[PDB]
Design a binder for this molecule. Structure first.
Ligand SMILES: Cc1cc2nc3c(=O)[nH]c(=O)nc-3n(C[C@H](O)[C@H](O)[C@H](O)COP(=O)(O)OP(=O)(O)OC[C@H]3O[C@@H](n4cnc5c(N)ncnc54)[C@H](O)[C@@H]3O)c2cc1C
Ligand SMILES: NC(=O)c1ccc[n+]([C@@H]2O[C@H](COP(=O)([O-])OP(=O)(O)OC[C@H]3O[C@@H](n4cnc5c(N)ncnc54)[C@H](O)[C@@H]3O)[C@@H](O)[C@H]2O)c1
Ligand SMILES: COc1ccc(CO)cc1
Ligand SMILES: COc1ccc(CO)cc1
Ligand SMILES: [Mg+2]
Lengths: 1213, 107, 54
């Protein structure tokens, strides 16, 4: 058996001094980065004046010669939406290959009227891109109804002439501006004109982010074929005068990442070498483009091997991009310059600012990292660029600097920095095709500055160029935007960033409007911190901490208030390798479980008397302890629960966030009148063995309740460690007792007489057993024992033909197979619109086969084991039933090493109907169904019809589809254009409805209120909206003479928070919404007319319909209802026939309540959140029925960066 | 339609244009249920007309109109209310229902 | 444009014929001007050959 973590994440090579200096700068505070850059970028006053004069001259020439789309908009008086819609139409018309066929469709069909009749795919799929072209603004989703109206309007107003102009404009832009040509041969033909003027070219075949082996092979052969064409055309001109190629490493391997570094070196490197050998033979440049920040250092390992490879010697065409917006840039340059010296290769170094700025900000915030790997003020990037240019210009004997910029100030500064001694081959400038030529036509040539410029020339079809055109077009801080803004003076454009930064009060301060990841929530609480698994220092330190964690003697014992108790002891084995003993658990006898509840009951007053602020301080101290102990906690979670390192980090972060969130919610709400329930039994699942465990216990404790913590039998060790941390943080032993063991221990705790509440997260079937146990029980006040039961899902994602396949596949692979599908939120049913289903399925299967399944103590493992052999057997029985029915089943092949553990390969099962699924299958099993677009509403019904309602995803660019689907789906956590596994505490408050939960949501503001006898008013919890049926009922009550009930009804209408609609603070590039809706149909079990009126008021005020128990005999109390109220009212003689219900209100004495609670628990389907009150309580207490539990929380997380950029961050420079 | 509003001119021609800004992303849910019912019974042309009406309806439009500072001037499209339907044929009734339901009305 | 330039004269007629104060006569003429310009602009935004008159 291999030692745990002995091969966790070894670096490709030992890190040299120069490499270590790169890693050390990865997230260096911005105030530390800038001073040396300012120093290196400083030039003499004479140079700065000459640079400003040159920049002004260039800018004056630019503004003096400065429209195609603008001219079209002007000529036809188009609104912006009309312009966008026209270009979308033109794009669609250009998908018709034959010109005569297109023109006939235009003249005879499109112009004459209904364009919709002649053009499965919305015309407006790419409207966000065309919106950027027309308006300069990015909108993440497309208002397809506005665009359709605008297209109809413009065609009916202007006819064929405007369509013709739009088609011709789109053809020119997509064929000649956004690309140099559609094919390398066309691009080469079009390059002769500017080559004759002194420009050169680097061709970009536009490949990027391979998702499958086949994609990577396609991009390879595209690069190889382009190299031949470019090399034939170069015809011996060499690497400086002649054209070259640019490649992206992500195009050449589907798993280009540090986590897969061994595959990258073994599989990607030979492909680059083969392309480089061909470039060498033709003597052309081959440049490696720079991508995301977490790929920088990995790419250096390839650059190192290639430059040291003797087979490539004699050729100086290898090139490499460095991004000056990155904090590591000067250190990367030091490394490259030294590599060039060692290898004797004159590396072509393209200095750029960087293309992924918005995404880098979002990623660092999502990952909770210490700082950004890029600057946050645009001027810092400018200074970085100029400083790095000074470094490169001192090294022209050993590297060939290539200054890629469209900024005339940047250009002029470097032109003068480089001085008057010039020869071709010393350095060059670079620019983008169809963007930089106006500037560089003022640079290239003896009559200008006599400096060469290489044009970066995209080559590809319409489909290829549109894929990432949004990123290429992206902002208010951009020079090209500012040059076209008449409000920006030339003096502003020639401002010297070096001197501006030098004079700032704090040199290098972070942008004021960009939150560090730790500060995402501002004053409310400190965000949990993650770990950067692309940072070699982090990987090396984590390796040691993980190894050290595997040497610890982890145990879990029955920790009663009186001390550890004896019991049956057994080992805890790693699910990925049963030979790896992780620790030992001593399980709780049912007698000691009952004893623990009695001890908790005796201890309840002493814990309730700890003021809420001090209880919250215990939670905050526990969060600090968990944060500090994260590396050790990761190792335990990895080995005990089959989690990968990434998933263990998320697990610990979630626990920290629960602690800090419930602490803050406590400080916002809890006072002397919110008395604790008493002893709370917290029963938790194995699959989030620290986060959910900690969340339930922390909430119960901070609400003033002593806790009996019963962790899942599979994962007691991390639970014991969480309890140890909470106790260290100040939770007394009497307030927090750990009771390891199986469901018998949970059941014994639930049945214990002093148990005052139950928090259960687990399977729906077990929750139903607990519901049955509790139906026997009443509190000493004669009321139901509160149960929070957060249960399973049958989670769907709907994908339409406007979604980007690569994005869908990434989110599907993550949502379905992360943690081997052992997340309650995991994607179970992918629903693909028929027109795109085959393409997406092919890509998905290709991506599936790139996953590494194995024991999770290796960073390269993507999918770990299932938790037990029983879980494996259950999942495999489902897979085989499906296979036996003829369903197509795609499965990864498992390595022989998996035999020592319990693994199920990620599996894709193609289904006929959603009804082919019965219950949740908690494993790595994705089901795929196809749907026709017109059946989308029926499909949403089918998703709802399972009775589950946990997570739901939708991938579409179309606002109409978003509005339709999100208004009709019934699930607690919705996700738009992203994965469906988000449960970021306080950002996506998590929890579902139906068979998926009773609520309230964990990680949301209603949670703590369920754990006290009188619920506080949560922060932000109110609504100005009044349910109109409630209002009609109140008027009906007054007309009946029920004056006090009418007043109570009006009060309920005001007190209801139905209609609350909030945006929760979170990361950039996402909108996280939280809304309160009706629950559905509430079962009313009244005893008296006044009780019925109060129950109906409560239910109607919260937007619900009702089914009233017909056995109450109260039919005559509801005569002559207004039709609006009658529509919401039904009478039920057989409650089981008239469900599912979404809650219940009960009136009666204690024994009536007990009997009704038993009858309600017997109803099929979802657990019902029941509220009961006596008739006297209804008379005495206006809040006898709490409106908090009569609404349903919905969280929706929208990825607003999905179109390729962040609109809001375009204004942050 | 309202004088001084964007629907007015369309009443004065025999085929109404699509007014500026006249659209809505919202689809009436009863319209949606009606279209599913039509498809269930095989009325394919009518179900298509129903879906098309659901999309072209501007019910739910909710705009702020440009005006003076210190004022918010809002313009919204709601259902008319209850529409009297006087059909002659089954298909005609289905088309009338589609139009009325798509615009949020009862009939 | 003509109503705008002739507003003072039009005001005088409205004041005397319809019993309006000067401020409300101004509002009357402004509203007429705005109708003219609004329906002109709405026309430029919408009307094409297939929108035949009644
Ligand atoms: C020929 C060529 C090849 C290129 N190849 C690559 C490549 O392989 N990889 C890559 O990542 N980029 C590459 N780029 C650069 C990238 O695509 C942009 O074109 C470039 O960053 C724009 O810089 P500028 O001098 O043209 O414009 P400017 O207007 O001077 O600078 C804009 C840049 O400033 C930066 N920026 C904007 N806001 C902020 C902020 N708030 N804080 C910090 N920085 C900010 C960004 O880098 C932004 O792109 C290339 C550019 C060219 C011209
Ligand atoms: N809605 C959510 O937030 C959420 C979160 C995580 C997991 N889940 C669900 O949890 C399930 C997986 O976790 P699991 O396998 O540990 O679930 P489970 O239902 O098997 O076990 C959950 C817990 O209940 C205990 N238990 C078992 N039988 C009991 C009984 N008769 N009485 C009292 N307690 C009993 C177990 O010991 C364990 O502690 C999945 O169905 C998943 O969807 C839901
Ligand atoms: C548009 O200029 C770019 C060239 C290459 C890259 C590689 O990421 C990005 C931008
Ligand atoms: C609708 O035309 C109007 C003209 C003037 C006023 C102000 O009196 C109001 C309306
Ligand atoms: Mg179980």
């Amino acid at each position: 058996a291999p030692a745990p973590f002995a091969d966790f994440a070894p670096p490709v090579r030992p890190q040299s001094t120069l490499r270590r200096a790169i890693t050390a700068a990865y997230r260096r505070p911005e105030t530390e980065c800038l001073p040396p850059l300012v120093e290196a970028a400083t030039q003499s006053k004479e140079i700065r004046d000459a640079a400003a004069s040159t920049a002004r001259k260039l800018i004056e020439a630019l503004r003096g010669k400065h429209s195609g789309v603008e001219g079209l908009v002007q000529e036809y008086s188009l609104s912006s939406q009309e312009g966008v819609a026209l270009m979308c139409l033109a794009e669609a018309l250009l998908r018709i290959p034959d010109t005569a066929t297109r023109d006939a469709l235009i003249r005879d069909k499109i112009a004459d009227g209904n364009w919709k009749s002649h053009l499965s795919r919305s015309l407006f799929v790419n409207a966000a891109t065309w919106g950027l072209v027309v308006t300069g603004k990015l909108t993440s989703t497309v208002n397809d109804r506005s665009l359709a109206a605008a297209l109809t309007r413009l065609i009916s107003r202007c006819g064929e002439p405007v369509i013709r102009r739009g088609v011709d404009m789109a053809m020119r832009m997509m064929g000649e501006q956004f690309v140099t040509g559609e094919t390398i041969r066309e691009a080469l033909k079009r390059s002769k004109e500017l080559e004759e003027k002194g420009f050169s070219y680097s061709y970009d075949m536009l490949g990027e982010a391979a998702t499958t082996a086949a994609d990577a092979e396609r991009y390879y052969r595209d690069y190889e074929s382009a190299i031949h064409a470019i090399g034939k055309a170069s015809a011996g001109r060499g690497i400086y005068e002649g054209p070259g190629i640019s490649i992206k490493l992500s195009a050449l391997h589907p798993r280009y990442s540090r986590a897969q570094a061994a595959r990258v070196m073994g599989e990607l490197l030979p492909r680059v070498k083969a392309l480089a050998l061909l470039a060498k033979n033709y003597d052309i440049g081959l440049n490696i483009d720079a991508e995301e920040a977490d790929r920088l250092e990995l790419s250096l390992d390839l650059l190192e091997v290639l430059c040291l490879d003797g087979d490539l010697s004699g050729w100086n065409g290898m090139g490499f991009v460095v991004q000056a917006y990155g904090k590591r840039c000067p250190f990367v340059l030091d490394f490259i310059i030294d590599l060039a010296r060692r290898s004797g290769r004159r590396i072509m170094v393209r200095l750029v600012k960087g293309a992924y700025w918005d995404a880098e900000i979002k990623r660092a915030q999502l990952d909770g990292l210490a700082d950004f790997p890029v600057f946050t003020r645009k001027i810092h990037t400018d200074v970085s660029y100029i400083a790095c240019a000074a470094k490169l210009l001192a090294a022209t004997d050993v590297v060939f600097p290539q200054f890629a910029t469209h900024n005339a100030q940047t250009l002029a500064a470097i032109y003068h920095m480089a001085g008057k001694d010039f020869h071709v081959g010393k350095y060059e400038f670079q620019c983008l095709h169809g963007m930089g030529e106006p500037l560089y036509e003022e640079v290239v040539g003896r009559g200008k500055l006599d400096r060469p410029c290489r044009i970066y020339a995209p080559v590809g079809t319409h489909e290829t160029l549109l894929a990432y055109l949004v990123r290429r077009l992206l902002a208010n801080s951009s020079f090209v935007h500012r040059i076209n803004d008449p409000k920006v003076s030339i003096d502003e454009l020639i401002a010297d960033p070096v001197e501006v930064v030098r004079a700032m009060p704090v040199v290098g301060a972070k942008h004021d409007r960009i939150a560090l990841p730790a500060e995402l929530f501002g004053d409310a609480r400190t965000n949990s911190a993650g770990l950067d698994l692309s940072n070699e220092e982090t990987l090396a330190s984590l390796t040691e901490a993980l190894r050290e964690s595997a040497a610890m003697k982890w145990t879990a014992l029955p920790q009663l208030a009186t001390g550890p108790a004896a019991g049956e002891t057994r080992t805890v084995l790693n699910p990925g390798d049963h030979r790896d003993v992780v620790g030992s658990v001593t399980e709780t006898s049912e007698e000691d479980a009952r004893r623990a509840v009695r001890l908790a009951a005796d201890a309840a007053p002493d814990w309730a008397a700890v003021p809420p602020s001090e209880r919250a301080a215990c939670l905050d101290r526990a969060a600090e302890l968990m944060q500090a102990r994260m590396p050790t906690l990761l190792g335990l979670i990895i080995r005990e629960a089959g989690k990968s390192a990434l998933n263990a980090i998320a697990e610990v972060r979630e626990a920290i966030d629960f602690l800090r969130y419930y602490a803050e919610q406590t400080r916002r709400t809890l006072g002397p009148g919110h008395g604790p329930l008493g002893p709370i039994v917290c029963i938790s699942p194995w699959n989030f063995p620290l986060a959910i465990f900690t969340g339930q216990i922390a909430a119960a404790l901070v609400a003033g309740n002593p806790v009996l913590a019963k962790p899942a039998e599979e994962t007691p060790l991390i639970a014991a460690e969480g309890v140890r941390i909470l106790r260290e943080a100040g939770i007394p032993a009497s307030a927090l007792q750990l009771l390891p063991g199986d469901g018998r221990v949970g059941a014994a705790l639930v049945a214990a007489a002093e148990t005052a509440g139950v928090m259960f997260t687990g399977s729906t079937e077990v929750a139903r057993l607990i519901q049955a146990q509790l139906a026997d029980r009443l509190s000493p006040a004669g009321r139901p024992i509160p149960l929070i039961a957060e249960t399973g899902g049958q989670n769907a994602m709907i994908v339409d033909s406007s979604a980007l396949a690569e994005q869908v596949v990434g989110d599907v692979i993550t949502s379905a197979f992360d943690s081997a599908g052992q997340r309650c939120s995991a994607l179970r049913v992918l629903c693909l619109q028929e027109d795109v289903a085959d393409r997406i399925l092919t890509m998905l299967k290709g991506a599936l086969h790139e996953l590494h399944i194995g024991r999770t103590d290796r960073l390269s493992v993507d999918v770990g084991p299932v938790i037990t052999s029983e879980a494996k057997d259950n999942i495999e029985k489902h897979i085989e039933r499906m296979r036996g029915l003829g369903r197509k089943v795609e499965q990864i092949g498992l390595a022989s090493e998996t035999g020592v553990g319990t693994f199920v390969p990620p599996t894709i099962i193609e289904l006929e109907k959603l009804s082919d699924l019965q219950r949740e299958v908690f494993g790595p099993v994705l089901h795929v169904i196809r749907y026709r677009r017109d059946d989308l509403d029926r499909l949403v019904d089918d998703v709802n019809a399972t009775g589950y309602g946990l997570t739901f995803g939708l991938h579409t660019r179309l606002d109409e589809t978003i509005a339709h689907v999100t208004s009709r789906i019934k699930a607690g956590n919705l996700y738009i254009n992203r994965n469906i596994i988000g449960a970021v505490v306080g950002v996506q408050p998590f929890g579902g409805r139906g068979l998926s939960g009773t609520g309230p949501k964990a990680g949301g503001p209603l949670y703590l209120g369920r754990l006290v006898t009188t619920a506080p008013v949560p922060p932000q919890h109110s609504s100005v909206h009044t349910d109109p049926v409630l209002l009609d009922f109140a008027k009906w009550l007054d007309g009946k003479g029920a004056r006090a009930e009418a007043e109570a009804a009006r009060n309920a209408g005001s007190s209801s928070a139905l209609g609350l609609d909030l945006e929760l603070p979170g990361p950039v590039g996402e909108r996280n919404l939280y809304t309160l809706h009706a629950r559905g149909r509430i079962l009313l079990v009244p005893a008296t007319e006044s009780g019925l009126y109060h129950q109906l008021a409560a239910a109607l005020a919260t937007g619900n319909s009702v089914a009233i128990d017909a056995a109450s005999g109260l039919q005559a109390s509801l005569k002559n209802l207004p039709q609006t109220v009658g529509l919401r009212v039904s009478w039920s003689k057989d409650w089981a026939a008239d469900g599912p219900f979404a809650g219940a209100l009960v009136e009666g004495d204690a024994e009536r309540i007990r009997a009704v609670n038993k009858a309600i628990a017997a109803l099929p389907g979802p657990l019902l959140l029941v509220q009961a009150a006596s008739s006297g309580e209804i008379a005495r207490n206006p809040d006898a029925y709490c409106l908090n539990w009569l609404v349903e929380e919905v969280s929706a997380s929208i990825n607003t960066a999905a179109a390729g950029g962040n609109a809001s961050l375009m204004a942050i420079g």
